[PDB]
Structure 1
Amino acid sequence: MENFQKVEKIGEGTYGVVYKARNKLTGEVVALKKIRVPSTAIREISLLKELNHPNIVKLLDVIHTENKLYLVFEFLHQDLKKFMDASALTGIPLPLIKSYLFQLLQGLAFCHSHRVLHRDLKPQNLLINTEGAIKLADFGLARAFEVVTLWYRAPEILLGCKYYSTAVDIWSLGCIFAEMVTRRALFPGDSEIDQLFRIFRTLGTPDEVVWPGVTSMPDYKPSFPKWARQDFSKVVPPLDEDGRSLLSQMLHYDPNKRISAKAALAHPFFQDVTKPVPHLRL
């Protein structure tokens, strides 16, 4: 660590504080994450160093010293949460929302083809730069090992599924997609049950018809209230039919019916996708 000069505190991640730092030797500016160490984690993280893609924040180095673990990542200048807050008055232009969604699906397609999942996607770990790129951060750290938001958590996780799949990332991204469009969180729950019931109230309480096996899930209760499903035209208004169609497929209850990243990239919504440059005030 003596090899790094902490510049400022970026934030408090899931495992440790994240600092903007400068490599005292290479003069390189990076994002340093101190993890709060099993050999299992070491190997798992080591694999992530090889998982490189344009839409994945590059894991530059893994420093394991004094029984402590530090992860050194590529540095970007702003996260999606801050960008959304800054675009709250006018909203992010649709062409830019489409580009971001398209790029993120590429990132997921890549990670998922390598059997790596994120598990905790959210505006805070989606990073953007001046060139119009957006990247996913903290990928794979879940498998390795303030109150965390439940807003983007997939229903199978909330119902107790222990062996969830890559589909949990598509769910989260669908929630983020809707939020960029409407400028309001889709499912802002403040407890697991509130999160679950907010999902039910919008998409309808799931049953054996739309989700085979759902009633036999660990945390499923026959006593769950039964709410009817709402039209997407009401859920995400400004979004065109193609967008609403894709979103619906990203939010299917049954993980096995939920669209994959690869298939989503082929959806009609991306027929006119372009790469606009955002207006970033750094």
Structure 2
Amino acid sequence: QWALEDFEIGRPLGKGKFGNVYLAREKQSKFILALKVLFKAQLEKAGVEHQLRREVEIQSHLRHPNILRLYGYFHDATRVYLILEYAPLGTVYRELQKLSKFDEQRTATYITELANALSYCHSKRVIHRDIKPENLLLGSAGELKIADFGWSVHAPSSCGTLDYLPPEMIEGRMHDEKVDLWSLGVLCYEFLVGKPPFEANTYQETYKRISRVEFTFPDFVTEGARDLISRLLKHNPSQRPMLREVLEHPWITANSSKP
């Protein structure tokens, strides 16, 4: 259905590897939204037309308040256009740059929102695999929305920064839902500390740190946080808590908010 002439394009919202995302308004209804614009050539060269379909299939059909809606799509001679829900307060990545580190209640709140959203996804055998702060968007209430479903896959199943990926994944092995639990632990640490726990100056060093699960806490991280993170960041996937154990963890319950 949709054509480019249906939209007034405005301000650029962000760039990814593939997406060049703009603010946009639909002329008839004046509906503000975001258009994610991708180049067919690029997609063709990098060979990710599958990721495009998954992203469209998965994301058009989920419905949860902490997951970003994709409303539709259309294409040009030259480009593909995804019609997305607009997240007006930007990324958790920009929040963290601006704030440096989050206190325990913002952190806990975000983890709660992530863990419900992921609970919902996993309910449908969907694993996201790319839960990074630049793909975590903020709605008008400051509520966290998971975006960028191009990496998602039905579970189980067999590029850029490695920081959020678990051992089983950077090493090739089979993985399932528990990937998203490891990433939740990396996010929890990053929110509190301000850098992810396996950060390094090189990919190869990072790879080592993840496979050795080589991380330490600064002094200011508290015992309840250390406990949640240590549990999520276990090498062995089967040893990572389910999402309900996360949601009930005394540190989450002590520090997070309800809707």
TM over 0.5: yes
Q: Render the CA deviation track for 1:140-171: whole Å, top value 9, x for unaligned.
A: 55449xx832211211111122x321211221
Q: 1:177 to 1:20 in 2, by over 3 A?
A: same
Question: Cα distance, 1:54 vs. partner?
Answer: 0.9
Tell me the amino acid that sits aligned with residue 163 of structure 2.
W
Q: 1:157 to 1:200 in 2, by over 3 A?
A: closer
Q: 2:219 aligns with which of 227, 237, 241?
A: 237
C-alpha distance in 2, partners of 1:98/1:71? 31
Matched residue SS, 1:78: coil
Q: 2:171 aligns with which of 145, 156, 159?
A: 159
Instruction: Indicate the residue corresponding to 2:116 in structure 1.
Output: 106
Asked whether the equivalents of residues 67 and 147 of structure 2 are also in contact (C-alpha less than 8 Å), the reply is yes
Instruction: Indicate the residue corresponding to 1:46 in structure 2.
Output: 57
**TM value normalised by structure 1:** 0.76
Q: Render the CA deviation track for 1:63-121: whole Å, top value 9, x for unaligned.
A: 24548532111111210111111112xx3222111101111111111111111111111
Asked whether the equivalents of residues 90 and 137 of structure 2 are also in contact (C-alpha less than 8 Å), the reply is yes
Asked whether the equivalents of residues 164 and 182 of structure 2 are also in contact (C-alpha less than 8 Å), the reply is yes
Asked whether the equivalents of residues 117 and 139 of structure 1 are also in contact (C-alpha less than 8 Å), the reply is no
Q: Render the CA deviation track for 1:238-274: whole Å, top value 9, x for unaligned.
A: 2322221111111111112222223311222222244
Matched residue SS, 1:98: helix
Q: Render the CA deviation track for 1:187-215: whole Å, top value 9, x for unaligned.
A: 224554221212356x35xxxxxxxxxxx
Higher helix share: 2
* Structure 1 alignment gaps of length 5 or more: 205-229, 278-282
Instruction: Indicate the residue corresponding to 1:217 in structure 2.
Output: none
* Structure 2 alignment gaps of length 5 or more: 41-48
Tell me the amino acid that sits aligned with residue 258 of structure 1.
R
C-alpha distance in 1, partners of 2:191/2:55? 33
Tell me the amino acid that sits aligned with residue 241 of structure 1.
E
Q: 1:176 to 1:67 in 2, by over 3 A?
A: same
Instruction: Indicate the residue corresponding to 1:85 in structure 2.
Output: 97
Structure exhibiting the larger radius of gyration computed from Cα positions? 1
Q: 1:24 to 1:49 in 2, by over 3 A?
A: same
Tell me the amino acid that sits aligned with residue 244 of structure 1.
R
**TM value normalised by structure 2:** 0.82
C-alpha distance in 2, partners of 1:40/1:127? 20
Instruction: Indicate the residue corresponding to 1:125 in structure 2.
Output: 135
Matched residue SS, 1:29: strand
Instruction: Indicate the residue corresponding to 1:6 in structure 2.
Output: 9
Instruction: Indicate the residue corresponding to 1:209 in structure 2.
Output: none
Structure 2 counterparts to residues 1-282 of structure 1, below 5 A = 1-36=4-39, 42=53, 45-64=56-75, 66=77, 68-76=79-87, 77-88=89-100, 91-139=101-149, 141-143=151-153, 148-161=160-173, 163-189=174-200, 191-200=202-211, 203-204=213-214, 234-275=216-257
Instruction: Indicate the residue corresponding to 1:280 in structure 2.
Output: none
Q: Between the two proteins, what is the percent identity of the paired residues?
A: 30
